[PDB]
Design a protein around this nucleic acid. Structure first.
Ligand code: K
Ligand code: MG
Ligand code: MG
Length: 148
RNA sequence: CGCGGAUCAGUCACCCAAGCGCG
């Protein structure tokens, strides 16, 4: 199957619950999706964040699924960040997500009901309700896929 | 590459050190 990458920012309070005791949860998730998942270590934050990074590699569907799981776990806090997803895209993909004078991010936001913003990489922050975020991430991933 | 799993890690896995191998 065709393999793709997704980098997601995880607040440190959520990492415990996505790895699980002795790694059980992350293993299961990797085994069930076929995805490979790597978190940066506890104090390895994305430049100018307090967030760890989660490298996911797998099929388009596995990326949406892994990210769906991560979102859920983040939604169970120890305020703004409860309902955001941040992902890291190459400048190339960043360019594709925006679109001619912002047409594309506007289309995405219409289709999702999410509020999407962009900060050699940029972080994309998606804002809204679970199903809204999940929808926008699907469109974003689709544009990760389509960039050669 | 395989076994291993120091130290880190506080739901902490994978990766990574010693050490011991197979090719
Ligand atoms: K090993
Ligand atoms: Mg091992
Ligand atoms: Mg080794």
């Amino acid at each position: 199957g065709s393999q793709y990458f997704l980098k997601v920012l995880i607040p440190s309070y959520a990492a415990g619950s996505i790895i699980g005791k002795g790694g059980q949860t992350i293993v299961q998730l990797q085994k069930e999706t076929g995805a490979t998942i790597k978190l940066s270590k506890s104090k390895d934050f994305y430049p100018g964040t307090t967030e760890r990074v989660c490298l996911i590699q797998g099929t388009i569907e596995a990326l949406n699924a892994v990210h769906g799981f991560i979102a859920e776990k983040i939604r169970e806090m120890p305020p703004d960040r409860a309902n955001q997803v941040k992902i890291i895209v190459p400048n190339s993909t960043a360019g594709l997500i925006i679109g001619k004078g912002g047409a594309t991010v506007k289309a995405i936001m219409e289709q999702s009901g999410a509020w999407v913003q962009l900060s050699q990489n940029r972080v994309v922050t998606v804002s809204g309700e679970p199903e809204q975020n999940r929808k926008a991430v699907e469109l974003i991933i689709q544009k990760i896929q389509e960039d050669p």
